[PDB]
Amino acid sequence: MDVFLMIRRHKTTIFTDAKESSTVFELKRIVEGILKRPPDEQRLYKDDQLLDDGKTLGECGFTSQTARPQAPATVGLAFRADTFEALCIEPFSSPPELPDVMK
């Protein structure tokens, strides 16, 4: 099974998919390959909860029902290790008002 994700950090958002059965550590390899920075220099999260390297993305909560192509789940990414920065994700821009034309 593929799961579809947004790996997110600061103003960085990566779109990628992965097997339900691949590991949190394997996701970090993929990030490494993209953001050019080693797995030990990075932590991953769902919501606030820090993820363990040897757990699969399934075990971590990312599943078919839950991480669909058109509605990928978010994985929080954090950096630096001689001290970890705190998980921080710049929110997206807000949509305008709504035109009163909208019952």
């Binding site: 035109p99 034309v101 909208m102 019952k103």
Partner: protein
Amino acid sequence: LRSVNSREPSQVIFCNRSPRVVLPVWLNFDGEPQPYPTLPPGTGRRIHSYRGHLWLFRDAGTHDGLLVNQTELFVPSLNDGQPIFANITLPVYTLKERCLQVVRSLVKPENYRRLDIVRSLYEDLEDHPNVQKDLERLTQE
């Protein structure tokens, strides 16, 4: 672009595998689209048709095009035993058409003019999808 009047009975199953209320449409021996009763989402219907006849399906409220067995038209084949299976599904719409669909379905068409976007988009919103249109399109092939 018409049905063949073979008079060789054919049994079909229309399954609506789509979030839309489906409108089946049989093309006449002349060529006029004939509309048939509608199918709620998920729901099925056992159908009596005939070898070599033409069908196509649409959203019944808005006439958005749908796919049957991956393609645009459906022609009941040699029936062999067992009823012929017609799977009705959303296409992957372009993101533009998709946006048109949503916007059409929220606004009254009177008020399209009052939407602040380019003018060309205003034309596109009015160019509603429709059978006669698509039959002209589909015909040229």
